[PDB]
């Protein structure tokens, strides 16, 4: 069992897949109270009951992103050993991700259940900047909209509780220090099981960025990681009570 009760990263293995879990309070300057993240071989859980919160940088809006991930997270210059990522986007034929989740939170708290990747020009960057892309996939949100503005909608299939459905995904785009693309499901799901192919979101992102002056050759970027977690907070959030459980994780990367 892996148990963390303060910010940090631990590597673990879940049904043979090497992963990293990060009790990530990246934009919190100070807090009081409790946080706990645990992996027991079958499930990863997170719980927070924190108060006296203030952000390091209110311009970043959210306060943290407790998560787990497969691959190399640029910002932490970290990857567990044994991951098949990073690989160039062009080499990915398909990348299936499956997980079951159950999110709970006080009603007022800005929060999402979001997955993400970082597409970078070089294989092991320690930051993203102009020319790089962040792609997020939001399956749930509460009192939180993605950054930038909504530009498009895409119909992309996924399997929900074992049934193939067609989701309608809003695409939000922001041009910051790097390009931010967030796909947000229009019928959010707070608890369930999802399976989907990341290649559909890479394809949509490539089309959306086809006329970009900032992103040069999208298919030559490196797909570095797949992160799964919950962003939370806004610049006004002073306390946060929420938690989640993830189970039934599997992936199939075909390169
Ligand atoms: O900016 C560096 C931190 O990024 C964190 O990821 C953020 C990202 O910057 C946002 O634009 C959006 O994609 O949500 C992410 C999660 O909140 C990263 O988790 C931190 O480790 C970095 O310090
Ligand atoms: O860290 C950036 C953060 O942005 C979040 O969206 C904010 C956005 O930054 C702000 O300019 C706008 O006014 O409000 C939204 C929130 O509604 C975005 O939700 C996160 O994914 C992203 O991490």
Q: What is the distance between the alpha carbons of residues 84 and 9, in angstroms, rounded to a whole number?
A: 20
CATH number of 1-255: 2.60.120.180
Q: Which residue has the tokens 């963390």?
A: 4
Dihedral of CA atoms 173, 194, 25, 238 in degrees, nearest 10, equals 80
Which tokens in the block code for residue 208?
């959306």
Q: Is residue 60 within 6 Å of ligand 2 at its C-beta?
A: yes
Which tokens in the block code for residue 225?
């990681």
Distant-in-sequence, close-in-space partners of 31: CB < 8 Å, separation ≥ 6: 25, 50, 51, 52, 53
- The answer to whether residues 28 and 64 touch, using CB atoms and an 8 Å cutoff, is yes
Which tokens in the block code for residue 186?
């229009």
Which residue's C-alpha comes closest to atom 10 of ligand 1? 60
Strands 133-142 and 179-185, bridge-based pairing:
parallel
Alpha-carbon distances, residue 106 vs 47, 54, 60, 233 (angstroms):
12, 18, 22, 12
Q: What is the distance between the alpha carbons of residues 5 and 178, in angstroms, rounded to a whole number?
A: 32
Query: Cα of 89 to ligand 2 centre, how many Å?
Result: 26
Backbone angles phi, psi at 68, to 5 degrees: -135, 160
Q: Is residue 205 within 6 Å of ligand 2 at its C-beta?
A: no
- The answer to whether residues 35 and 25 touch, using CB atoms and an 8 Å cutoff, is yes
- The answer to whether residues 101 and 160 touch, using CB atoms and an 8 Å cutoff, is no
**Helix residue ranges per DSSP H, the chain:** 198-208
Secondary structure of residue 28 in the 3-state scheme: strand
Backbone angles phi, psi at 28, to 5 degrees: -100, 120
Alpha carbon distance, N-terminus to C-terminus of the chain: 32
Secondary structure of residue 71 in the 3-state scheme: strand
- The answer to whether residues 189 and 140 touch, using CB atoms and an 8 Å cutoff, is yes
Q: Calculate Rg over the CA atoms of the chain.
A: 17
Which tokens in the block code for residue 242?
């929420």
Strands 240-254 and 87-88, bridge-based pairing:
unpaired
- Exp. method: X-ray
Query: Cα of 29 to ligand 1 centre, how many Å?
Result: 15
Which tokens in the block code for residue 193?
């099981």
Query: Cα of 141 to ligand 2 centre, how many Å?
Result: 12
Backbone angles phi, psi at 115, to 5 degrees: -110, 155
In terms of Cα–Cα distance, which of 70, 47, 74 is closest to 232? 47
Which residue's C-alpha comes closest to atom 6 of ligand 2? 147
Taken in order 198, 189, 15, 10, the sign of the CA dihedral is positive
Query: Cα of 60 to ligand 1 centre, how many Å?
Result: 9
Tell me if the bond preceding 86 is cis, omega within 30° of 0.
Answer: yes
Which tokens in the block code for residue 229?
């977690």
Secondary structure of residue 216 in the 3-state scheme: coil
Which tokens in the block code for residue 169?
């995904």
Q: What is the distance between the alpha carbons of residues 242 and 206, in angstroms, rounded to a whole number?
A: 35
């Amino acid at each position: 069992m892996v148990l963390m009760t303060k910010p940090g990263t631990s590597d673990f293995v879940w049904n043979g897949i090497p992963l990293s879990m990060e009790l990530n309070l990246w934009n919190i300057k100070e807090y009081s109270g409790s946080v706990a993240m645990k992996f027991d071989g079958e499930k990863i859980t997170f719980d927070a009951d924190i108060q006296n919160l203030s952000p390091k940088e209110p311009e970043r809006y959210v306060l943290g992103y407790p998560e787990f991930y497969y691959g190399y997270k640029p910002w932490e210059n970290h990857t567990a050993e044994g991951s098949k990522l990073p690989v160039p986007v062009s080499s990915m034929k398909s990348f299936s991700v499956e997980v079951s989740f159950d999110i709970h939170h006080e009603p007022s708290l800005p929060l999402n259940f979001a997955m993400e990747t970082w597409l970078t020009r070089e294989k092991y960057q320690t930051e993203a900047s102009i020319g790089d892309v962040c792609i997020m996939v939001w399956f749930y949100f509460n009192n939180l909209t993605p950054g930038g503005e909504k530009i498009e909608e895409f119909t992309i299939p996924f399997v929900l509780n074992g049934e193939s459905v067609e989701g309608t995904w809003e695409l939000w785009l922001a041009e910051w220090g790097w390009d931010y693309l967030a796909f947000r499901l229009k019928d959010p799901v707070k608890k369930g099981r999802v399976k989907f192919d990341v290649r559909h979101f890479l394809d949509a992102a490539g089309k959306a960025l086809s006329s970009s002056a900032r992103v040069k050759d999208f298919e030559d970027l490196y797909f570095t990681v797949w992160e799964i977690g919950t962003e939370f907070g806004s610049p006004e959030t002073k306390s946060a009570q929420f938690g989640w459980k993830f189970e039934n994780f599997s992936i199939d990367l075909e390169v």
